[PDB]
Amino acid sequence: RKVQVSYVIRDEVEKYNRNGVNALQLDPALNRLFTAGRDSIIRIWSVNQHKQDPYIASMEHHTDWVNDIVLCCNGKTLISASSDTTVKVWNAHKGFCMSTLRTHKDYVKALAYAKDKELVASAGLDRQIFLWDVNTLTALTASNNTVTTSSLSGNKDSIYSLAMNQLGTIIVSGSTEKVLRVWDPRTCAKLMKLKGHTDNVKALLLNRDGTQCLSGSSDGTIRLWSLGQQRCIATYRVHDEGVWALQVNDAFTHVYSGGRDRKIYCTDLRNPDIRVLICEEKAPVLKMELDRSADPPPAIWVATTKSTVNKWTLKGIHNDCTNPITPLCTQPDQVIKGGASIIQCHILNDKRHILTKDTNNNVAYWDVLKACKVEDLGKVDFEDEIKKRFKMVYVPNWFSVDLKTGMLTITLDESDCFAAWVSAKDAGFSSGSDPKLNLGGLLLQALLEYWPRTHVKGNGYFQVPPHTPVIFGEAGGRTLFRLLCRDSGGETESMLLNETVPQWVIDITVDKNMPKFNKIPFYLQPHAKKDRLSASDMLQVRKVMEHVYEKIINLEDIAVLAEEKIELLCQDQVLDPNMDLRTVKHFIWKSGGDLTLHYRQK
Amino acid sequence: MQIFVKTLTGKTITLEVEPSDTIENVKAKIQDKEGIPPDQQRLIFAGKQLEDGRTLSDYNIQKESTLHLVLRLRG
Amino acid sequence: ENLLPFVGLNNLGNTCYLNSILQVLYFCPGFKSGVKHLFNIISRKKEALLASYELICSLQSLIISVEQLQASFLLNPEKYTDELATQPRRLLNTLRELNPMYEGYLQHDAQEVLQCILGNIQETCQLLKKEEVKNIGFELVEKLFQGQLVLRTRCLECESLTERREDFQDISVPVQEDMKTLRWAISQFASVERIVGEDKYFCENCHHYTEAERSLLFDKMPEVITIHLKCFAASGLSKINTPLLTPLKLSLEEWSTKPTNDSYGLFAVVMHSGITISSGHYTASVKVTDLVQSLKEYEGKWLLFDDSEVKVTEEKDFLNSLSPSTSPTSTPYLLFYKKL
Ligand SMILES: *NC[C@H](*)CS(C)(=O)=O
Ligand SMILES: [Zn+2]
């Protein structure tokens, strides 16, 4: 539909999560943990205790929340599902993306894995489940090779969970349709429709043989289903709120559950009266991953809406109270630190600088044009800082700000990207001249100055950092192409740009033809000869004064007498000579209609 | 902010607006999403029609406020 | 070949929307008494010594004319022979001043005119209450046509609810999907709806676009429920000339915040006859219950109000005609329910 150009203001290395973690994967062989964050980066961690810094690598190709990740092929390949509607195949040993699957029309919520068949299923809000064979997802590019898709049909509403067994013979989907739908992934045959849940299902598990299933719903119930008898054997009510994460041991006898009420339990499936409160978390539990290095699991990894991933010891699990209150462990054993998410944003009057507040209540000052941070202002009042930096200026909006990733994402759209014409002096630059500059044009020539199609390099005034992600996407979240600013010179990126960059960007950046000046009409009439005038949005009141003095009442430099002879009024307010007409019409013109000015002699 | 409009069939759509947005702009956006010409539209918020030439701030339309879309059955 | 005591209005041009609303609103449980009290206040204020008060004065003149003409018919039946009707010249001029849309003799909407009259009464009444406090009848529209609404939205990611409390004069209701009943349609207006796809809730808790569920519940309940039927669809614009099943008794307990035992009984229907959104004819039907045993002879029977002629219809005949079993030729547009 409509293609937008976005970029992210961020550091070159983002070691720590800048938002909550949506998914977890453990690699027992290498002692390696994977985190899929709402900041759109998959991070790799070491889980050896002696390792002071667990950080290994960062996996950066998504543009929205990474909702699920799956390790497969003995940890060689990882498959990622995101809200950018894409499924990505990675080299988990190195940390680079091999392929992108764009078969989904909406957010991709769920990934399922069958170990023995090397089969992965992907589901999301577009009501579609796609079955993938990981061995044929060794495809580099579409031109080099192409893959064909299998789909499972039947969902009448958005899918939030998926589950296959190891043998790859049963696949179960949970949705806001409230009913569990079961297929045979081998023949794509509809098998069952399990009923009993009253709210959304966000957690599904299957045992090895695919004869039983655990379902955790947002209504607070865990149900154990018999897929052979198509019935719910047992219901467990252990949570006061929705159950969002489920985990089960290998023997499929104890279930580890967590959700919105920030508690994690271990419920015996064959005798639910005995249950142990493992821990009290600080944010709602999103995912849990057991350490499966022992027959009774020794630890558990919890991902919350916070940026900290904690590991809780399970040693001591074996009391007599039906509903014990004391948690088994009061403190985590291993903690992976997190960052701060930009939660609140404010674009200043010049429409070039941003004030942000993060989760630690730190205020930062950002330069959008140069895609950098100007300064950190500490834990000062956000609104007092906004009022402190008020300036009596109007610049039209030319960009949007999204904080979905905990980082500043700036979106440019052809509707308004070129609406900001400013002067070089008023935008910090210089020449002995003061030309009129378009902020969107300058930013676009800065974001893709490494593209050979735009050379004769850059806008000649500023550069964005070379590590800046430049994203070409659609209104709706569907990402077309993402690249770093410095990668635009490669052959692959050059071709993908020749296919992806829209014509509105091409005109300004490649064809070098400049956008349209915007003009406002304004009346000018006596104050105790009337004619309508129009001029640029930017001209200073000095020029209107010069037009009035030298042409209406004109019966040493000529321009000197202009400023001291005529004075200009808008709604009984004397105008600052250096003020532009945008500002007058925005602030001093609170009435309705077209702007009208009045003039009087000193 | 984001406001809601309940369309003719009862379906609810989402509009991204600003407090300084005239009713004509809102009707243009509703035409974009629904195809009804603005001159045929009637918007009702809290039991009041939103007359043109007035902004969304004039009616205290906040985030996730629901507007109702009706037409004129002339007789 | 005899007339009826109950008195209609005159066409006066293309005035059938206004006549329909006026004959509905003259039969509301407490509209006449409230307008008489407000006019008493305005008369006292004038004797103590405006455009806003003109509507109340016009309504009072209309009501006194209607009732005195009906009475004169009762004691002098032969004084009138062909038609028994009056004309709202003053009221139309007043609305024409207070809204330039009604300049001329062109066809207008009935719900819009009802909304204009009610809003103007409410604003005059608030102004008058402010003037008094500067120095029980000041809440007429508020008590009798206004109700409070609760709009719950639930994010499907964090499952965190948000409450919006808004107001409503009318319950605006679809009549067909994108033999249906009024319960189905109120449910489509007020039961849980999921926002998915292009319409996605922006959650300030998630700082993200998420699917959500909205539900509308009724908190405070006006004495008269008016249901505005959306008998029109975007085909370019058409009229849905197939009515839905309308009960005589209605209970809004399903979509209510707190449990209540409050039934609502239908007493007025405003009907549009035509195959086009832009042209048609408006008619009003009301159920007579209270204001000469001749006047009580009509108890429980329905009155059909054409321009100037009045016809008495039995309840069974009216309900059969309104039902979509046969082609009604005049679809319901405005449904009025009063507490019981
Ligand atoms: N559509 C307005 C009413 C028409 S009429 C013929 O009854 O005046
Ligand atoms: Zn949310």
Side-chain angles (χ1 to χ4, degrees), chain A residues 1-517 519-528 530-589 591-602, chain B, chain C:
Chain A
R1 201 63 258 172
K2 311 298 288 185
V3 166
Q4 309 180 313
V5 178
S6 301
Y7 69 108
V8 186
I9 313 180
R10 52 160 292 187
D11 291 345
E12 179 148 344
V13 187
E14 287 286 335
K15 273 172 59 83
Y16 298 132
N17 282 279
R18 305 305 290 310
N19 220 352
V21 181
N22 273 330
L24 293 154
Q25 287 294 319
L26 275 169
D27 185 24
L30 297 169
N31 264 334
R32 196 152 300 193
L33 175 84
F34 295 75
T35 50
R38 299 176 167 191
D39 62 310
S40 67
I41 295 90
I42 311 165
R43 282 167 186 84
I44 293 158
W45 311 91
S46 284
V47 294
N48 296 115
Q49 185 63 253
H50 45 80
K51 186 65 66 68
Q52 314 170 356
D53 201 18
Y55 184 80
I56 290 173
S58 161
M59 265 170 49
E60 289 176 281
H61 203 279
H62 281 298
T63 67
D64 210 334
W65 289 10
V66 188
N67 299 311
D68 194 271
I69 52 168
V70 165
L71 291 173
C72 48
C73 289
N74 301 334
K76 288 187 222 321
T77 182
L78 184 84
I79 294 174
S80 171
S82 165
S83 297
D84 60 9
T85 72
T86 61
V87 177
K88 285 184 184 60
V89 184
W90 310 77
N91 204 301
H93 283 346
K94 311 196 155 316
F96 65 88
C97 190
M98 303 167 105
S99 305
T100 313
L101 300 170
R102 302 198 199 70
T103 58
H104 281 279
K105 295 169 163 182
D106 215 322
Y107 297 179
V108 183
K109 307 302 277 192
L111 289 170
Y113 183 49
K115 210 171 72 54
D116 301 329
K117 288 203 164 299
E118 289 319 343
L119 173 77
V120 172
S122 63
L125 299 192
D126 53 343
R127 293 180 181 177
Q128 294 174 348
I129 305 167
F130 286 113
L131 290 161
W132 310 104
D133 186 32
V134 176
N135 279 330
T136 189
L137 282 71
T138 179
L140 282 72
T141 55
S143 64
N144 195 3
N145 194 359
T146 309
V147 291
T148 187
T149 69
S150 284
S151 184
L152 306 159
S153 62
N155 286 272
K156 284 150 144 170
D157 189 8
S158 310
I159 307 157
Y160 274 77
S161 61
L162 261 190
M164 293 183 286
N165 52 322
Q166 290 190 334
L167 294 174
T169 62
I170 295 288
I171 173 168
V172 186
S173 88
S175 45
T176 58
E177 194 190 1
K178 295 180 177 67
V179 293
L180 300 195
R181 281 179 186 277
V182 188
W183 289 269
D184 187 13
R186 284 177 308 210
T187 46
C188 302
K190 291 174 71 175
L191 282 175
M192 293 182 286
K193 202 153 81 208
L194 299 167
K195 296 183 290 294
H197 271 320
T198 300
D199 215 338
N200 189 0
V201 181
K202 297 168 94 166
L204 284 164
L205 292 179
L206 291 171
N207 48 350
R208 182 176 162 288
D209 63 358
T211 57
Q212 284 172 33
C213 170
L214 278 167
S215 187
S217 182
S218 305
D219 57 15
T221 44
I222 302 171
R223 279 168 204 259
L224 168 70
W225 308 85
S226 168
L227 282 71
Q229 313 184 345
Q230 294 179 356
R231 200 177 65 270
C232 176
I233 312 160
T235 311
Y236 313 99
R237 293 181 184 271
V238 286
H239 287 280
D240 291 331
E241 301 200 62
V243 187
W244 292 359
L246 275 180
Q247 285 286 291
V248 65
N249 62 339
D250 289 320
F252 204 91
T253 45
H254 293 73
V255 62
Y256 306 77
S257 64
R260 189 177 151 81
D261 61 335
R262 310 166 328 128
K263 281 181 185 68
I264 297 164
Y265 293 94
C266 169
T267 307
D268 199 336
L269 287 184
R270 66 185 183 273
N271 189 359
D273 68 355
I274 60 170
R275 77 189 70 121
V276 191
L277 178 59
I278 299 277
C279 71
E280 181 65 26
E281 265 284 339
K282 299 291 180 68
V285 176
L286 288 171
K287 269 288 189 304
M288 290 178 290
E289 181 86 331
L290 282 71
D291 204 337
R292 304 187 163 277
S293 65
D295 174 69
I300 186 166
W301 288 93
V302 193
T304 71
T305 46
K306 279 195 177 35
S307 58
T308 291
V309 179
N310 300 291
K311 168 177 119 158
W312 302 85
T313 187
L314 300 186
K315 184 181 179 180
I317 282 290
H318 285 111
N319 204 6
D320 300 326
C321 200
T322 64
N323 50 3
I325 305 170
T326 187
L328 183 63
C329 48
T330 56
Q331 279 288 117
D333 217 325
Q334 192 153 342
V335 184
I336 285 166
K337 313 166 270 272
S341 314
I342 286 153
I343 55 167
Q344 184 177 2
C345 189
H346 181 261
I347 308 166
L348 277 297
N349 266 345
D350 47 1
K351 302 282 162 68
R352 178 181 173 181
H353 285 96
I354 279 181
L355 280 176
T356 48
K357 207 180 52 199
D358 63 332
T359 51
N360 296 115
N361 292 316
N362 285 96
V363 186
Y365 196 47
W366 304 82
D367 196 0
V368 164
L369 213 63
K370 305 201 181 178
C372 66
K373 181 195 269 198
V374 183
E375 59 175 349
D376 291 331
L377 306 153
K379 305 195 184 205
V380 299
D381 202 355
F382 190 57
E383 293 83 3
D384 206 359
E385 204 69 26
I386 292 185
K387 296 183 290 294
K388 197 191 279 223
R389 318 187 98 107
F390 185 84
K391 183 175 174 66
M392 187 66 203
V393 76
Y394 178 51
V395 178
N397 289 318
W398 52 285
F399 65 88
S400 308
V401 177
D402 189 358
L403 314 170
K404 47 172 175 185
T405 49
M407 284 138 69
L408 273 182
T409 304
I410 311 286
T411 313
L412 306 174
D413 196 1
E414 86 171 317
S415 303
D416 63 358
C417 172
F418 312 104
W421 282 96
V422 303
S423 181
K425 296 288 183 68
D426 308 328
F429 315 116
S430 286
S431 56
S433 185
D434 44 356
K436 183 63 65 68
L437 304 180
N438 194 285
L439 304 179
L442 297 179
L443 186 60
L444 284 173
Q445 313 182 51
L447 292 175
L448 61 84
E449 78 161 354
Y450 287 89
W451 197 12
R453 220 177 153 205
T454 68
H455 301 178
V456 304
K457 310 180 202 198
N459 43 18
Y461 291 120
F462 63 90
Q463 313 171 251
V464 297
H467 63 256
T468 312
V470 185
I471 313 164
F472 295 84
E474 268 177 354
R478 190 141 174 175
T479 294
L480 278 78
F481 183 50
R482 171 202 185 273
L483 74 164
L484 276 69
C485 179
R486 68 186 154 216
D487 304 348
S488 306
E491 55 267 14
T492 307
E493 286 91 7
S494 280
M495 295 298 102
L496 286 173
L497 288 176
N498 268 315
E499 304 197 334
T500 309
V501 67
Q503 185 72 23
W504 64 270
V505 183
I506 286 174
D507 291 331
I508 301 299
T509 307
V510 180
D511 289 329
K512 300 294 187 291
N513 63 277
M514 61 79 71
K516 63 172 187 68
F517 293 133
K519 293 180 110 203
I520 46 182
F522 71 99
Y523 293 101
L524 188 153
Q525 61 202 30
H527 200 268
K530 174 207 196 80
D531 50 352
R532 199 210 199 168
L533 295 187
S534 187
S536 46
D537 291 331
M538 284 73 74
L539 78 165
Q540 301 190 315
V541 166
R542 295 179 66 250
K543 299 293 183 182
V544 184
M545 296 180 150
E546 187 91 31
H547 182 71
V548 160
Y549 163 72
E550 274 289 327
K551 198 180 182 292
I552 304 306
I553 304 167
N554 49 359
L555 276 76
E556 187 169 351
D557 195 71
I558 176 155
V560 170
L561 299 171
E563 58 90 20
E564 60 96 25
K565 193 70 171 67
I566 197 53
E567 65 254 35
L568 260 57
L569 278 295
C570 178
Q571 278 188 201
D572 289 330
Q573 293 180 357
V574 174
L575 272 297
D576 210 326
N578 296 115
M579 192 183 243
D580 75 337
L581 261 67
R582 286 182 297 206
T583 316
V584 189
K585 182 175 174 66
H586 192 243
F587 291 115
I588 293 176
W589 195 257
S591 299
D594 196 62
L595 181 77
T596 62
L597 278 74
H598 310 318
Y599 60 97
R600 303 179 308 106
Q601 290 76 249
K602 289 284 197 298
Chain B
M1 72 291 291
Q2 192 193 57
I3 68 174
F4 298 110
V5 175
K6 291 177 71 68
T7 59
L8 303 186
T9 61
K11 200 187 77 80
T12 190
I13 72 171
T14 51
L15 260 56
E16 182 72 29
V17 291
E18 287 88 5
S20 62
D21 211 42
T22 54
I23 303 308
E24 286 284 332
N25 304 346
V26 180
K27 295 191 176 180
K29 299 178 183 181
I30 296 159
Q31 178 176 30
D32 292 332
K33 283 184 76 70
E34 274 292 272
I36 310 171
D39 58 355
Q40 282 281 263
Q41 292 182 5
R42 292 206 285 135
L43 296 182
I44 292 151
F45 168 67
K48 286 187 297 295
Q49 293 180 177
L50 291 72
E51 56 259 17
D52 306 328
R54 300 188 74 186
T55 56
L56 261 55
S57 55
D58 306 315
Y59 296 102
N60 203 2
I61 288 161
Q62 295 167 341
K63 204 196 173 292
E64 60 179 354
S65 291
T66 316
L67 270 48
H68 293 90
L69 179 61
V70 306
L71 273 59
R72 286 160 193 266
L73 198 63
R74 292 179 184 278
Chain C
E1 51 182 3
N2 50 1
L3 295 171
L4 297 173
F6 292 160
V7 65
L9 283 80
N10 277 344
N11 237 331
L12 182 147
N14 263 320
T15 312
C16 54
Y17 52 106
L18 188 152
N19 292 7
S20 301
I21 293 306
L22 268 59
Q23 294 297 109
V24 168
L25 183 63
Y26 172 90
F27 281 96
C28 287
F31 192 72
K32 275 201 306 165
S33 175
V35 163
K36 182 174 72 68
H37 179 83
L38 259 68
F39 174 79
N40 277 354
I41 294 171
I42 290 179
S43 177
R44 217 171 309 275
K45 186 180 289 293
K46 184 198 297 292
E47 205 266 330
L49 304 180
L50 195 146
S52 73
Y53 300 175
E54 269 296 326
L55 190 146
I56 300 291
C57 294
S58 298
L59 271 174
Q60 174 60 6
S61 172
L62 175 80
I63 288 153
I64 189 67
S65 56
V66 160
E67 56 189 354
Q68 66 183 357
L69 183 62
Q70 156 173 342
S72 190
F73 177 95
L74 273 296
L75 73 164
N76 285 121
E78 74 263 3
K79 196 174 296 149
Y80 315 97
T81 59
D82 62 357
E83 288 304 312
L84 183 63
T86 186
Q87 65 183 357
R89 298 276 302 170
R90 303 187 39 182
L91 180 49
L92 185 56
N93 296 116
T94 307
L95 294 174
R96 185 177 293 170
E97 286 184 329
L98 294 174
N99 207 320
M101 172 176 319
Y102 311 112
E103 266 291 332
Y105 299 111
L106 73 165
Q107 309 204 351
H108 283 110
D109 193 307
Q111 188 274 331
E112 188 162 1
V113 168
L114 171 77
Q115 197 193 351
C116 182
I117 290 178
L118 293 187
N120 270 6
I121 283 182
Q122 184 178 2
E123 65 90 18
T124 62
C125 198
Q126 284 170 343
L127 186 140
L128 191 153
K129 182 174 72 68
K130 165 182 65 99
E131 212 277 340
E132 200 278 338
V133 70
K134 281 179 182 179
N135 292 115
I136 66 169
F138 300 148
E139 44 184 1
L140 199 79
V141 178
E142 296 88 351
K143 186 180 289 293
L144 172 84
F145 290 110
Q146 183 177 2
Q148 184 67 41
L149 206 77
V150 181
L151 302 99
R152 291 193 227 271
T153 180
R154 200 176 101 102
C155 189
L156 290 201
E157 275 275 322
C158 54
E159 302 164 12
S160 58
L161 283 72
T162 302
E163 295 294 328
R164 282 285 177 288
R165 222 169 272 272
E166 312 199 309
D167 182 7
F168 79 90
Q169 295 297 109
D170 54 347
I171 288 189
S172 182
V173 173
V175 297
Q176 70 165 2
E177 54 94 19
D178 49 353
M179 295 298 109
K180 293 182 183 293
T181 66
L182 185 65
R183 182 211 167 164
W184 165 88
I186 299 182
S187 190
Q188 291 279 318
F189 167 78
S191 290
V192 182
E193 183 178 1
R194 270 193 272 290
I195 307 180
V196 307
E198 285 306 300
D199 313 329
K200 269 205 202 81
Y201 180 50
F202 189 79
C203 189
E204 296 289 329
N205 203 339
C206 310
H207 292 94
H208 196 70
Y209 283 119
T210 71
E211 294 188 355
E213 292 189 343
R214 317 201 70 235
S215 81
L216 273 48
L217 301 196
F218 296 111
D219 199 12
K220 210 205 72 191
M221 273 318 279
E223 293 179 353
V224 171
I225 291 308
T226 187
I227 292 147
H228 178 216
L229 277 67
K230 283 180 175 173
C231 49
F232 62 87
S235 302
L237 295 170
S238 67
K239 187 173 130 74
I240 306 162
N241 63 7
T242 175
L244 61 83
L245 277 296
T246 63
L248 293 172
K249 293 182 184 293
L250 176 81
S251 169
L252 296 151
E253 183 178 1
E254 294 187 358
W255 316 273
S256 70
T257 53
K258 64 168 151 307
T260 48
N261 284 319
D262 282 329
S263 296
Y264 284 80
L266 183 136
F267 77 97
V269 186
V270 166
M271 294 176 274
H272 183 255
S273 173
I275 62 170
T276 303
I277 301 299
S278 68
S279 184
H281 187 154
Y282 272 114
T283 306
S285 285
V286 306
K287 176 172 204 180
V288 69
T289 308
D290 209 10
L291 304 102
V292 289
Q293 286 75 240
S294 52
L295 275 299
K296 276 74 69 177
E297 185 67 51
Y298 301 98
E299 161 73 26
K301 298 190 180 35
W302 273 76
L303 270 62
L304 188 153
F305 283 115
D306 190 358
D307 49 356
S308 70
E309 50 177 0
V310 298
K311 302 183 187 124
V312 162
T313 309
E314 208 73 28
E315 192 143 6
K316 61 97 176 179
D317 197 13
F318 167 71
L319 211 56
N320 196 3
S321 304
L322 198 70
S323 68
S325 167
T326 60
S327 291
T329 312
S330 62
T331 58
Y333 184 36
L334 281 161
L335 269 47
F336 295 97
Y337 288 89
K338 65 186 197 150
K339 213 173 286 293
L340 280 177

